[PDB]
Design a binder for this molecule. Sequence first.
Ligand code: NA
Length: 130
Amino acid sequence: KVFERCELARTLKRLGMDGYRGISLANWMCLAKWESGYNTRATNYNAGDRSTDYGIFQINSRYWCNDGKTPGAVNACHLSCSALLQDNIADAVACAKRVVRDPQGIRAWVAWRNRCQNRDVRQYVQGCAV
Ligand code: NA
């Protein structure tokens, strides 16, 4: 599914993401926007290492989830990557929480560093009542 802006904002907030590891709701929104356009079914396959990024947060199969088809992969969130392509984003949020608990934090996502880090992102939650 493709979430509407404020719909996703409310959902992420309900799922405890606002301020998680010091990351504002607006930042999580900015990450989802640039990664998948709020599309839970988004997948990005990389032929170079045969890994695939899954879901709204575009979580990579070489390290975070298992898809049974990525060479030399690990599964840090202990979850199947298909659970990251569901309309119910509870699993995706839980795994995103895990990712950011590593040293680099939210800087793990190159898109976030390029389009969100140090920039105004207040627009993402404008008029959402969150
Ligand atoms: Na994996």
